[PDB]
Design an enzyme around this catalytic site. Sequence first.
Site, PDB file in Angstrom:
ATOM      1  N   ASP A 287      79.722  86.899   0.152  1.00  0.00           N
ATOM      2  CA  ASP A 287      80.046  86.098   1.452  1.00  0.00           C
ATOM      3  C   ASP A 287      79.332  85.292   1.835  1.00  0.00           C
ATOM      4  O   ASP A 287      77.994  86.027   1.875  1.00  0.00           O
ATOM      5  CB  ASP A 287      81.194  86.617   2.268  1.00  0.00           C
TER       6      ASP A 287
ATOM      7  N   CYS B  95      62.088  55.132  -5.246  1.00  0.00           N
ATOM      8  CA  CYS B  95      62.549  55.601  -4.712  1.00  0.00           C
ATOM      9  C   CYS B  95      61.620  55.993  -2.779  1.00  0.00           C
ATOM     10  O   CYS B  95      62.286  55.396  -2.587  1.00  0.00           O
ATOM     11  CB  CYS B  95      61.307  57.634  -5.118  1.00  0.00           C
TER      12      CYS B  95
END
Lengths: 362, 362, 362, 361, 364
Positions: E38, E170
């Site tokens: 979790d 980029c």
Amino acid sequence: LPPGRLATTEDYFAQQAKQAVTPDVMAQLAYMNYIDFISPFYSRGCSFEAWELKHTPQRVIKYSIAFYAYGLASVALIDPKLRALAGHDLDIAVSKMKCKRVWGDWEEDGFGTDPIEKENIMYKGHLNLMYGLYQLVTGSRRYEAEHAHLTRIIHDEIAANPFAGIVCEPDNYFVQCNSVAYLSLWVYDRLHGTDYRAATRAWLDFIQKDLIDPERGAFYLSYHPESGAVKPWISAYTTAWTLAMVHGMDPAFSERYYPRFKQTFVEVYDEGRKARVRETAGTDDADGGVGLASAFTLLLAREMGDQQLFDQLLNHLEPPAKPSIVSASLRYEHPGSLLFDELLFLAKVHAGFGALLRMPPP
Amino acid sequence: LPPGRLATTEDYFAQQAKQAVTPDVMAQLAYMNYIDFISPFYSRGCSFEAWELKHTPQRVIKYSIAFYAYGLASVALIDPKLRALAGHDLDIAVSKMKCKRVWGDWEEDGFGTDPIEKENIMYKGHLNLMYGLYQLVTGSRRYEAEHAHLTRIIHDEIAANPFAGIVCEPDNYFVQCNSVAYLSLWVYDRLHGTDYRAATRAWLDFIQKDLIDPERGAFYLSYHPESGAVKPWISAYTTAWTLAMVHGMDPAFSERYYPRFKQTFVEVYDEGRKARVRETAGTDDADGGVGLASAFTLLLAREMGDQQLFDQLLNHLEPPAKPSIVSASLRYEHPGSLLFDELLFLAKVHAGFGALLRMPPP
Amino acid sequence: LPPGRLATTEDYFAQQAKQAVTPDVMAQLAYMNYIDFISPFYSRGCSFEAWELKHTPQRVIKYSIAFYAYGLASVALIDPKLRALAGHDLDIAVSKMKCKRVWGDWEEDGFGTDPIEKENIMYKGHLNLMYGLYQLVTGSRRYEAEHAHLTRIIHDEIAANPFAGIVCEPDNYFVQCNSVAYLSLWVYDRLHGTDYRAATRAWLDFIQKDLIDPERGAFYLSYHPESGAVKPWISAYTTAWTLAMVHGMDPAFSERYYPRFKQTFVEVYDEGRKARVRETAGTDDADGGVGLASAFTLLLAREMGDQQLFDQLLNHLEPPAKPSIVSASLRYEHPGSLLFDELLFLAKVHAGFGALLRMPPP
Amino acid sequence: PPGRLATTEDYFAQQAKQAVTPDVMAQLAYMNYIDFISPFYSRGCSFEAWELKHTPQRVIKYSIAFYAYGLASVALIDPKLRALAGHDLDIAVSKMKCKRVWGDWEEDGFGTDPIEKENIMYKGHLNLMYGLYQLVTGSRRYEAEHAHLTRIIHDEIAANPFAGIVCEPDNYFVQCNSVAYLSLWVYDRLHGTDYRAATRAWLDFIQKDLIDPERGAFYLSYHPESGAVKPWISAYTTAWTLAMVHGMDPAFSERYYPRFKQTFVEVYDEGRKARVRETAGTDDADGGVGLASAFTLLLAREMGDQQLFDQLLNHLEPPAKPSIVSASLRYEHPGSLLFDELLFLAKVHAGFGALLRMPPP
Amino acid sequence: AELPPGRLATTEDYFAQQAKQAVTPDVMAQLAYMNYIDFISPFYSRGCSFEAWELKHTPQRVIKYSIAFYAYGLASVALIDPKLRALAGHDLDIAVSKMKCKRVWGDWEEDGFGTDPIEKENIMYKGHLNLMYGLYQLVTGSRRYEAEHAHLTRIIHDEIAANPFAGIVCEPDNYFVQCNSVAYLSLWVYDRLHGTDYRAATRAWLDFIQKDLIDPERGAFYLSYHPESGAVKPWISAYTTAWTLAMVHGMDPAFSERYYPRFKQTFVEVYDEGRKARVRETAGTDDADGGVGLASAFTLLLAREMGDQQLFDQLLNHLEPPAKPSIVSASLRYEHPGSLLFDELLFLAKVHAGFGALLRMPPP
Ligand SMILES: C=CC(=C)CCCC(C)C
């Protein structure tokens, strides 16, 4: 009295008949209530000093408050002289549970500005059960309007979903979080004579399909409706929590799976004096994952009336945590997990979720 | 003078008759006033360097200032040549008390943006008593308007409540916080010829019902009007503080309970030379909880004229704190609690709350 | 000559006659001026790297700049070849003195957004004296408008007050802070032919009432007009500073008290070779409180022409501070106090406040 | 010698061989190789390379400029590296214009525009970098900005009663002016203008109160408002100024160089090493900003003094513990600010005169 | 045959996973690390929580590559085990959600390049996002992201059409072959889903990168290209080449087959009597895994893509043992990860079915 233990299993199980908590439970209530500003149940305000001092992660505070609240409801049933105190503490539990520090992860994760409107059943399931237990303990209508509103949201969301229940994060379904929400409908029905609990049968049928391994008596970690995925690992803490809460609504369901659950996960060691719980299959390691398998099995053992397993798990959990009572207040020097004092408190007092449902009026 | 003691109990109790403070009290006033910028009573400004240097937690600063103020009022009564200095220091105490650093926890906890408007009797009780003591010492009307406004708020809140007194945080009632507010009404009445103090009798009757254990001479920790709950632990620091202040308003009340208080909490040790105070029942541990049972009992011993217990407690408290006087200024190397130099200062000079009420004019 | 000293007392006192600073004073001017960005007198900008590197507390930076400025004024009088450099450094001193980093404590304490408008004589007294010394050294009218404005504020505030002078923080009166403001009026009068200095006589009469112990030749710590309180401790650093500055305005005043000051505070030790100064009465400890009694007495010894006491104090102060000259720049490895290199620099060059007033033009 | 990467002979032969030494190539690899963290990775306002070396904010502008001056010489040394040098200079100019680099001007309270007036430290370097970029690449990308800044510098010189421009207000530094004047020579080479005509009055001005002509040493700084000259001579100030002036008036630097060396340079270890005193009246080497030896290394290269170059590099490089890992140069213990920048520059420097005469691409 | 010391499973076992229709136990334990606990597992929720990356100290700029490489691995898991296909789909759904969080793309804005990470340039981010949209839809058949996928595919296609060089930069003026290789592969995936021909632009790109961007004798790409100046950085890069050849093999197998043997000669050091290998990042050094430190990890992926079991075995014998893998509660952890993207790239290399096989993924 085994070494490092504060009281006998016989003493914890006799508290209700004697109408008195053990001295160590009283010392836990003193930790919870005694010292100005830093005790967790000092005030209604949005102060979390008690949780900062124990290093509780933000995401776990909601579970801390809820598990304290469930314990306080059993204290109310055990000792009528502590019922008003339990009521006061539950009032504070509800106020703190509504602080943004507790629910705010829902907004920070990007899921919405309102923690109750949709999904988030982890948070609002506990809140709804807490509203109900507060009103059972005190008879106060302080939160009745909010309780009716949240109960209707939970009912409407169940009615709208093609699967039985409600998700936490979007597309994340957990049986343990649903089990709290369904139990909150039983509590609302007890207070108001309604039938919101009628949705329970379809839920119990649904979780016995792909969400359980019926041979091992174990629930899978989670379900994901969009993809249809069930995560392929079974979880002890998930199962222990779910079976404990389901026992209050359908005792036969939990009675059916409990012995298979124990065979799958529970390791008895030290010549029958101790037990520890494996979190998943295909490992010998105890208390992996969130690290709460043993602590939730302690609660389940209490719910099912299994004194032997209770004694074995508490002999594993409590001594290494090094309890001390100083000025009539309980501290653990080395808590072994998250939610440590919360879950040991709850397991020590727990009267059964069925008994909380039938709590006599004040 | 025992080792680590700075002066005899006889010397502290003779200060008023001799019209002179002991050299160690003068050295405490030097700590409070001497060094530029870092002494606590250097300026009216919202600078808290003195409190940052001794690591005073934010929530305790309001009590630090108040207890210094109560001590300074007794200095004014002891030595007329120090009355102007005491007055100047009280002026600064009131200014600092109004800074947001001091009251701001009320807003951060979510209770409101105005610390005076309702509840919060912990903060505004001390502020109201400080306004009064400032005006008794100096005759200055600087704060008179604010004093009248806060006194009327306190009177109106008492009149409106079905229980006698005012809460701190909502639904949290503390006898010690109320005792300060009621004493502030006696001081207002002394300055203005009013009868706000008439509310005291109903309050003294109320706190002798469920809030006291009359056999043990001990108040319960707190009362919670919404639930009707009284926390089931008795508290020494709560009782010592409350009986000390009540002695100034109804001497017979404190005289009735004082011997039972001592039997319940006070441990004499080291062949009668020392004493230390247990914070609650059902423990042998001294000075648990907030850790102030012994320090507040020292003040109560002074208020009640109990030289023997005063001497025993100061023999426990002062030597391990390792006082030193350097350049005519008092420092403790190892203060044993919060509010350490504040409460030892106050206990050393305290003339009785009754005597402060009858302070001759300037 | 004596061990750990850089130059003889005879050498420091001969600098003016030889029209040359000692090599160690030149090395101090190199620390002040040499290295790009990190030397304190590198630029007019609001950069305080030099003060960050020495860990100067924010509240002390204003005194650091002022004492450097007073030293630079004497350098201008000692060596005509360094007068242009002294002028440049004073220009930078004034610019830096006006930065919010220097005066900002006035706003943060809650006293106002304008550090000049009222009170705050600690800050604006130094600023006003610095404006004047800058103009005496350089003949530049760069700050003349600002100088006239601040001089008129100081004159008007003196005229309005029932006590002689101006407070620092509200209700806090310090003789040493006033002494700087009054000297700034003498400097303005020397530049413009005005008579702002006429207020000095009433001030010298006022500080000789309750603010001085005339037998001990020592000023009390502070005066508080609202309460009429004089703090009951005498202060060496307060007295040394005040007498040094007053000697420039009324030499007979400082001559009267200087011998009593020395008897009260100055401890000669090590067979007459060393001296250290007690900060207050009723102690044997040297350099308590702010820790500047010895350093300000060094300045006073220079102002009064007392070579013996100068030599004794510098033998106490300099050697343990471990001066080192690296690449013709002076550093102290263990400065013994705040404002250490500033006050030793000033005492080494100081020509007398009277001589700075009659500074001939360039 | 031990801890040296290549011989003085090798560094001085690079131009004739039309190849950089392997250690200079390894420096260009540190400058260019690794994604995100290499200083010449992108045009963006990212300063990770400078954060990792703990470069103080105020020094970043000098770091970029000294890298740029080195890259201009790399372009002249190896025609096969000229396009790389051009790319790196493009990035140098972009980074030089980021607020992280010039922002101290605003934070100090001197103004919101770093070019409009004064601040010759910053805008002198920027203007020289605009010019070197255009000499190396032939690109007109920054031509408009270059013309605008050149005209600001020319106008400010014409308006001042002293020869040159201040840094912070009322702070005059000869070394900062030397960069601005050299930037006018580069503009003139590109455009056929005569902005450089202002140089003669500047060279006459700095030879009055700003120099000690016997010691061949400039004073630290001049302050026009007060007329003050700070009374200390500075080796790093002198080494830098004489290196740049040699490109504009070789005879000026030739006159003072031998006196500079007598005043400041300490030969030690039986003639194998040298270190430079920062000021007079001390035996201590590399006081003040700690760059006397590193700037003397550049001056030795500019003046063609192989012996002093070898001696200074034997002092500077070995204790800094160079290592080449994966064909990239790192120093474990740089001995000063601008350490890899100034050693890079001194190793490749072709002379400021040769950069002015750079053939077109 | 035999299990070398500190390895979790044999090379034979990893290469047999597809035929056996089952992942190895250690790959299942990696999926447990990815999915089990979790809040802190990386694939716990769609939300903008990055606890998993904070706990491994992943630099902000690397999170986008972490998510992408996990996603490429999950696509192969879907092809290996039909019983895990729904889980792989769920994880890819989360990968796409997290990839769109500002924590992942935000460096584009902080660097000063723009407020929108997709509109222009930034092909390293939006190439991965576009390939992830496509793999998600191949695995699940879900149309959840179809509109976004069409929008981003058309942006990439339009930007290629507009540029005088073949591909997209980029950061502005920074051209990287490896970042382009992801974008081009994303066009092949879109075409497989929709029957379009966006992939027709690939031929001009493959012709362009074989001019100044490659050393054809050494089988190695140069670090980067800079269109404004025309500059090619004069160093060859192993991690650049390994990544580019792996992805190109899915689009033009003959291209990668041509250069692969030369790549290995240039960069790959076999040591310890043929049992181990490590990869030099550039020429003119003997040092392994310099620069970004990923030459060996990307060569492991390339070895898998090219079917080279021997080099795979040698590289994994170098990489895995010193990282000290342990399985605790059926979940995989490395005590000493030897590089950035460590568990991501070993996961991917262990399951990788080939980029061609992912393109031909049968429907659910
Ligand atoms: C005003 C600027 C300068 C004095 C430039 C030189 C600075 C360096 C190299 C630290």
